[PDB]
């Protein structure tokens, strides 16, 4: 009973300017909970499943980096695409990992905005739902090894 | 004291948990089921070897049906006595010019403590096993001291049965198999080293060696400086009333040309485009004995043959599973027992496939940790990061010691690649654990991060390729 | 059916002896070890051999590796770096629990009565392998009349290593000579897997 | 009478970033269940060593280096008037265990703290040894017999007597090794902290469109508990048998700094020059840390400071009553407390109380 | 009356590193499913022997030997484990070299954790009396109280001078029994932090004792001295307000 990442992606693309903008203003992920357009956007995708909403929050927030910085195409890792941008320095990523919980989602969004990355969205979605020490580590490893391939 | 008549053999009932010293007649005639109780693995294997050889020259089975029958019923005492007479004359541990596996009037300076024989004070049985060990299995001091015939860390592989006698009997070739394995019979002599000596620097046709002479071949000038107690043995555990401490060494050299056909160890042959050279199996590597089982149970003809004892068994009862003793030397003792289910003779390819699985994993894990270690080295990091693949692989091998045997003991050879794929799993999980476990205490260090990425990537790329 | 005495060997860490740089464990208790446990419970001193030999000639064991729940937790092992002011590595067992069927051989002198009294009020501090390893659950008394008595005493399904026949074997240097104080012989466990 | 002197401090810093790790993050630390901002024992120790207060009342800090070429250069300069050059060098090589020729770069096994007075004393011993035609190894035995002299030289550099030294290669391994009288624990916030991130830009006066640099920095305000105990006998030994009162003098100086000194980074840009709000000092037979007063992360009431101090007193009373401790105790605080702990209205008074060993 | 005296201690150490292995990592252990920080029985035992308290009260020559064995011991000391799962923090340190201005002279890491530990130790009383040559049970009990005091008070030395976890015990419970036993299984299901780890650790300990102790054997005199207010285990365990009173209770063999 997972979250249809691609359906959600398309759903965010289909939003009215009013809502794309309404959600983009948000500073922290929890403020999304003050937005009605949020609840409307997310609810089919399994919001109202407690054990789902933290994930949903993160996914939406990262999309909320806006306007379309996250562009979808074995799969492409977030780490890989972040490196493929070439805009982002390793130190910053390390800092993403070293930061406590809410801070880490915020910082990531800042990175996404700067990188304008080409990922495999549903993959990034998976990584984003299970977000955890391991997932973080993998973000590092993919980043460094990719940035080193280049 | 005499190996055939008196009692030596350190022994324990399987369930019965009481140590006893028994005699060959007793072992050959009782429905009692004995196992030997020795404190060392090499010592145990040697005792077994000696007992097998003895059984091999006193009583080969006339046919396979009689082999079976004798395995199933002990002998009457008279039967044994009859079988045992001539030999009685040959097997005394004290004599004038014929002491068991020794040579008279050995001269040197000074004495060697009994200890060095093993590689203290010892009973007759304990000594005779020691003697036989150093002359057969151990490397051997010289240094101007020959060893052989195999020789100097050979790997013995015996077939195991229920009971001690079941085992001994089981590893003794049918007479036709015997005179098949040793054809020419123009061989001076069949008389053992200590009856009709060799003299430096003899040059010897392996084919001139009778099976008696060669099973009991002793390459050393050894004399047992005479016994003292009245008291307790250091191997046997028990009181012996006659114990050896003294022992006399003497340099000696000859040359046996070509390979003698010992029935107890797998011949393996290699052909360089130059030279067709074959030697017995050596524990050359630090691996778990299971790696080598391809050469101990599977025939290939580069290539290898297995102990005539094993191949015989494979012929005799083709429907039976196989309990197998493996023992030898590196110095470092090694002794393992291995079971293969009813299929083994038929399907060696399956066995090979499994050994190959094990090895393939070990390889992937090593390639991974090595690229980490080489990275570590390059960044100039101080400490055991350089040896990670070593240490790790060591752990792996212990684990694999536990894993692979289980598989082979239980496989359904005809049907099952499911269980093989399941082992593939277990191993996969194992390598993951070990990579993480040994790369862990370094991994938090920024600089290393690149080399870690590679490392892990490598572990998994290889690990994918391991699966169909 | 003959009489069995059942036991519980369970502590956050245990360590069962095996030949040696490091000092490693097996995955179940050894015979030398179980003898240790038992002799300990009784008034047994190392020097007084005759009594230890009587114990060992009197008792036989069957051991069940059986595991944790929460979701299950398979046993893990740790490596302790243990120093003396000389370095050792000492393997211990993490999340080990064992059930142990203990029966008397056709030899005397003990009767299971003596042994349960012994287990209950041990003269000696008892420990899973090394005294470093206390135990969480007392060796509870069993009474039950093969593997079957174990089938009685839950948790079921962990497979049993045992000196009765039921067949695979597992060869071990467990059996202690008593005449050469701290050495061992070659014993064989019979193996009964799963159910 | 009592051997250990315990120092407990509650200090509240404004938003700041007082201890960074390699990635310019604050030093996280988890207790008992929650993240707390951490300032390292090391940063604190060096803050005190390099301080003007210390400079004024304790003396010169030690010179901690791994570069022996530079060290012999300084030693040659200062001690050059007092001793022959060759002697200074040999002394340095003997203590170091490394050879001092004239090479531009020469290194010890690891960073080592040095006292110039100490080296001077050694040069004198080395001089007598050369004139007396004493063998170096024999010199080792002789110097080894009486350690205390070397410890009296330690008296010029107190931070070593407080915080200790280890050597692996030199003559020092055998001769100059010190435990360190004072144990210090890393500051922890009494309460949970989720650090803030400041987003800065650098504006380039020569480019008009946008900034030349964009970045982030972690920072937090926090109420920190600083803890430290001075073992007094050890101090006396390490000074070569200095008086209890002399030791206590050192103790009051340590109390003062633990209460007043804040590490330098990045104070120039965040400026948390905050003095301690609670300083509590107790004598005991066994050193005791009140950190457990805060394992339950303090929840804010009227700020963190007030409930932190309340938590502190409640735990102190509880511990002291449980383990029946009757050591001399005084507390100085800026705010609004339980009995039988003497109340000092001023820090200077608390200090005099330490000098006089509990009134 | 009863032969084994069980000593249970719960103590919370502040960020620290009380035991390293070959590689200067703190000493872990897995239980029942989760990582916990460990202190070796050896480290504790040495902490107690080399302690001044021990030197004063056990050194008084043959008594320490009878208690702890040559340097065979009557008292057993168990590896300490954390009640809760622990992920170790890493401190990255810098050595600033007074002679080079442009950098650090050394960079390194050290592992460290704060943790709530369960120390367990059991004293065999018959063994101690025999090893002393037949001293009275009361004579033994004195020594036993000394062990309690240390088990509750003594902490290993490393790296105390730099991390300084000089923490006193928050919970000490002493129980008499026929067969010595460890309450570590109270924490097999790793305690989760609710307003610290310490308090819920003590809840776990108490609830476990209620359940198990009347469920298992055995029931012999038991007393608990605790610093925290949690609903204490059913009053079959007598409650001591001070450590010294607990000690006196041990001296008098669980008087009542
Ligand atoms: Zn013997």
UniProtKB/Swiss-Prot annotation, chain A:
One of the GO biological process terms: defense response to virus
Tell me if Kinase is a UniProt keyword of this record.
Answer: no
Q: Any idea what a deletion of this gene does?
A: Loss of resistance to bacteriophage lambda infection, loss of plasmid silencing. Increased levels of 57 nucleotide crRNA and also 2 and 3 spacer-repeat units.
> What does the record say about induction?
Repressed by H-NS, activated by LeuO. Activated by the BaeSR two-component regulatory system, possibly due to envelope stress. Part of the casABCDE-ygbT-ygbF operon.
**MF-aspect GO terms:** DNA binding; nucleic acid binding; RNA binding
List GO terms (cellular component aspect). protein-containing complex
Q: Recite the UniProt keywords alphabetically.
A: Antiviral defense, RNA-binding
Matches recorded under InterPro entries: CRISPR-assoc_prot_Cse2, Cse2_sf
Q: What interactions and quaternary structure are annotated? A: Homodimer. Part of the Cascade ribonucleoprotein complex, with stoichiometry CasA(1),CasB(2), CasC(6),CasD(1),CasE(1)-crRNA(1). The CasB homodimer forms a cleft that cradles the 3' end of the crRNA. Interacts directly with crRNA, CasA, CasC and CasE. Stable subcomplexes of CasBCDE-crRNA and CasCDE-crRNA also form, both of which are able to bind target dsDNA. Binding of target ssRNA or dsDNA causes a conformational change in the Cascade complex.
Can you tell me which family this protein belongs to?
Belongs to the CRISPR-associated CasB/Cse2 family.
**What's the protein called, per UniProt?**
CRISPR system Cascade subunit CasB
Species of the source: Escherichia coli (strain K12)
The taxonomic lineage of its organism, from the top, reads:
Bacteria, Pseudomonadati, Pseudomonadota, Gammaproteobacteria, Enterobacterales
Curated annotation (Swiss-Prot), chain B:
A GO cellular component entry from the record: protein-containing complex
Cystines in this chain = none
GO BP terms: CRISPR-cas system; defense response to virus
Instruction: Recount the UniProt induction comment for this entry.
Output: Repressed by H-NS, activated by LeuO. Activated by the BaeSR two-component regulatory system, possibly due to envelope stress. Part of the casABCDE-ygbT-ygbF operon.
State what this protein does: CRISPR (clustered regularly interspaced short palindromic repeat), is an adaptive immune system that provides protection against mobile genetic elements (viruses, transposable elements and conjugative plasmids). CRISPR clusters contain sequences complementary to antecedent mobile elements and target invading nucleic acids. CRISPR clusters are transcribed and processed into CRISPR RNA (crRNA). A component of Cascade, which participates in CRISPR interference, the third stage of CRISPR immunity. Cascade binds both crRNA and in a sequence-specific manner negatively supercoiled dsDNA target. This leads to the formation of an R-loop in which the crRNA binds the target DNA, displacing the noncomplementary strand. Cas3 is recruited to Cascade, probably via interactions with CasA, nicks target DNA and then unwinds and cleaves the target, leading to DNA degradation and invader neutralization.
Q: What NCBIfam families would the database entry show?
A: casA_cse1, PRK09693.1
* Stated name of the protein: CRISPR system Cascade subunit CasA
- Which organism is this entry from? Escherichia coli (strain K12)
From Swiss-Prot, chain C:
Biological processes annotated in GO: CRISPR-cas system; defense response to virus; maintenance of CRISPR repeat elements
The record's keywords, sorted A to Z, are: Antiviral defense
GO CC, any one term: protein-containing complex
Disulfide pairings: none
InterPro entries named among the record's database cross-references: CRISPR-assoc_prot_Cas5 (IPR021124), CRISPR-assoc_prot_Cas5_N (IPR013422), CRISPR-assoc_prot_CasD (IPR010147)
UniProt key word Ribonucleoprotein = no
Q: Does the keyword Iron apply?
A: no
Query: What effect does gene inactivation have here?
Result: Loss of resistance to bacteriophage lambda infection, loss of plasmid silencing. Decreased levels of crRNA.
**Triggers of expression:** Repressed by H-NS, activated by LeuO. Activated by the BaeSR two-component regulatory system, possibly due to envelope stress. Part of the casABCDE-ygbT-ygbF operon.
Mind telling me which CDD domains this protein's record contains? Cas5_I-E
Pfam families cross-referenced by the UniProt entry: Cas_Cas5d
The GO terms this record gives for MF are: DNA/RNA hybrid binding; RNA binding
Q: What does this protein do?
A: CRISPR (clustered regularly interspaced short palindromic repeat), is an adaptive immune system that provides protection against mobile genetic elements (viruses, transposable elements and conjugative plasmids). CRISPR clusters contain sequences complementary to antecedent mobile elements and target invading nucleic acids. CRISPR clusters are transcribed and processed into CRISPR RNA (crRNA).
Query: What does the sequence similarity comment in the record state about its family?
Result: Belongs to the CRISPR-associated protein Cas5 family. Subtype I-E/Ecoli subfamily.
| Classification via NCBIfam families | casD_Cas5e (TIGR01868), CRISPR_cas5 (TIGR02593)
Q: What is this protein called?
A: CRISPR system Cascade subunit CasD
Query: Where does this protein come from, organism-wise?
Result: Escherichia coli (strain K12)
Gene that this polypeptide is encoded by: casD
Swiss-Prot record, chain E:
Q: What happens biologically when this protein's gene is inactivated, per the record? A: Loss of resistance to bacteriophage lambda infection, loss of plasmid silencing. Increased levels of 57 nucleotide crRNA and also 2 and 3 spacer-repeat units.
Annotated signal sequence is none
GO terms for biological process?
CRISPR-cas system; defense response to virus
Q: Please provide, alphabetically and separated by semicolons, the GO molecular function terms listed in this UniProt record.
A: DNA/RNA hybrid binding; RNA binding
Q: What induces it?
A: Repressed by H-NS, activated by LeuO. Activated by the BaeSR two-component regulatory system, possibly due to envelope stress. Part of the casABCDE-ygbT-ygbF operon.
Q: Which domain of life is it from?
A: Bacteria
- One of the record's GO cellular component terms: protein-containing complex
Pfam families in the record, alphabetically?
Cas_CT1975
For this UniProt record, the keywords arranged alphabetically read as follows:
Antiviral defense, RNA-binding
- Tell me which NCBIfam families the record gives: casC_Cse4
Q: How does it assemble?
A: Part of the Cascade ribonucleoprotein complex, with stoichiometry CasA(1),CasB(2),CasC(6),CasD(1),CasE(1)-crRNA(1). The 6 CasC subunits make a helical stack forming a groove in which the crRNA lies. Interacts directly with all of the Cas subunits. Stable subcomplexes of CasBCDE-crRNA and CasCDE-crRNA also form, both of which are able to bind target dsDNA, and at least CasCDE is able to form R-loops. CasCDE and CasCE complexes have endonuclease activity. Interacts with YgbT (Cas1). Binding of target ssRNA or dsDNA causes a conformational change in the Cascade complex.
Question: What is this protein identified as?
Answer: CRISPR system Cascade subunit CasC
